[PDB]
Amino acid sequence: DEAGITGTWYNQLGSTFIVTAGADGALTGTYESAVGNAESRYVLTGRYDSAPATDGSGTALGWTVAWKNNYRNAHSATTWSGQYVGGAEARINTQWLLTSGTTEANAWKSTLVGHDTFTKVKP
Amino acid sequence: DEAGITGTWYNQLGSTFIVTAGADGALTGTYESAVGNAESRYVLTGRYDSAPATDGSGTALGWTVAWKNNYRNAHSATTWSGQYVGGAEARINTQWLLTSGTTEANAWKSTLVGHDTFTKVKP
Amino acid sequence: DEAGITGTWYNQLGSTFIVTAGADGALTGTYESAVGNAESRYVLTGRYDSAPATDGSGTALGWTVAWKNNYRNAHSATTWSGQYVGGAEARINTQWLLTSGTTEANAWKSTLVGHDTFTKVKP
Amino acid sequence: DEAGITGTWYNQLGSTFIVTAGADGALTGTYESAVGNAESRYVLTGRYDSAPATDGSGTALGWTVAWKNNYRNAHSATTWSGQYVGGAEARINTQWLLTSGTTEANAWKSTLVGHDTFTKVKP
Ligand SMILES: [Cl-]
Ligand SMILES: [Cl-]
Ligand SMILES: [Cl-]
Ligand SMILES: [Cl-]
Numbered sequence A, B, C, D: 001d002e003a004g005i006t007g008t009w010y011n012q013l014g015s016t017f018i019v020t021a022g023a024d025g026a027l028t029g030t031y032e033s034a035v036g037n038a039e040s041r042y043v044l045t046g047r048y049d050s051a052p053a054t055d056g057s058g059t060a061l062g063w064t065v066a067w068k069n070n071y072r073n074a075h076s077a078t079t080w081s082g083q084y085v086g087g088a089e090a091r092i093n094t095q096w097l098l099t100s101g102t103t104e105a106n107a108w109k110s111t112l113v114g115h116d117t118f119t120k121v122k123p
Helices: none
Strands: A007-010 A016-021 A026-032 A042-048 A059-068 A073-085 A091-100 A111-119 B007-010 B016-021 B026-032 B042-048 B059-068 B073-085 B091-100 B111-119 C007-010 C016-021 C026-032 C042-048 C059-068 C073-085 C091-100 C111-119 D007-010 D016-021 D026-032 D042-048 D059-068 D073-085 D091-100 D111-119
Touching (some): A016 A042, A073 B091, A091 B091, A111 C091, B026 B059, B111 D091, C042 D073, C059 D091, C091 D073
Parallel strands (some): A059 B042
Antiparallel strands (some): A026 A042, A091 A111, B016 B026, B026 B042, B059 B073, B073 B091, C026 C042, C059 C073, C059 D059, C091 C111, D007 D016, D016 D026, D026 D042, D042 D059, D091 D111
């Protein structure tokens, strides 16, 4: 699912995930968020299972964006954890954790959680 | 906190996180889990805020491991999302999401969540 | 949104959530899961904001099921945390945490996380 | 673990959880948060496994607080999902989800996630 994963994906919010899946298990690309303290593209890196099971299961993967680029720094990072599901309507189904840098006093409210589903057509 | 982050870290379970923080915001290294369907080291990649706030807040970061190496493939990936907190007892405080590849029928039980705290001395 | 919330709801998996919202903020009812180690109905209790904002925001709420009834005991409990969104296609959008009782050794893999969306018509 | 659970508990933040475990699986009590948009006590309700396994596993449980009382309304609800672990240093180890009521536009940032550990002595 190297060929399955590589390309341009869009989530439910209208964000754009541009990724290359390497033969070695690497994910590399850019992320553009349609929401939050973000503008333009951000570097992403991650990993995927380059030898998934052949029993109809999805392909596990994850990636990170730190929300610093040449335009903005939101002092925060999101990780998406999920699986790719191949087929006519391919999907990447994820859950995510968005941690902000905080003082120790505020650390209890550091981390947002949510879920994004990515498709190969805007959605 | 490039110099702060780079090095060897240990969590509460006795896992080993070996990371290099690049000037450009990259995290690269290896992870060895003391638990689960894992043996030896696994590639990791991630990102961190290379220009954190200077108001006493932590440094946001995240990374991914896909649990495939030359020994084992657990058809799963974990992402850690958290912040580095500098000082005498430096810490990386994370929450994580562990997604397994599943059938669509089993996707509701695909994802474990937990929390790991890393220190520079075993802990 | 007492009248909005009270009634029968269905999620994406085909589970059935039967709830009464009390004037005092209580949620009481039964839950029937279409998946997992479950059969028939389970007691639920929870709470909701009985005086939500009037600026178009949702109504925050949560509830718990312990997966013990007269038929089965899965030694586990789920909590749903979310918001009710009123209107023609009313919805309750949740994220959930499913904790199993474990030994200390296995506690790192105790907790599943996911997301359920409930509608007033099967869905 | 009815007798184990019933009583006064304290988390790492200095919050106070006062609970009664009923023979029927109910949890009822009050919660006082040391942080956030909160003052004084809030109603809680939840559920626990009233017939846990006898193999050394913990007792699964969960509860909800809606953050409305006679003093304040934060238009939000937290659910804690976790397990009770009996013994000399009894503990309840939880993960939590704090959902705020939001507009649809802001729903992606509705939910905080974290972890609380409760002990029978301040901690
Ligand atoms: Cl959804
Ligand atoms: Cl902990
Ligand atoms: Cl979804
Ligand atoms: Cl902790």
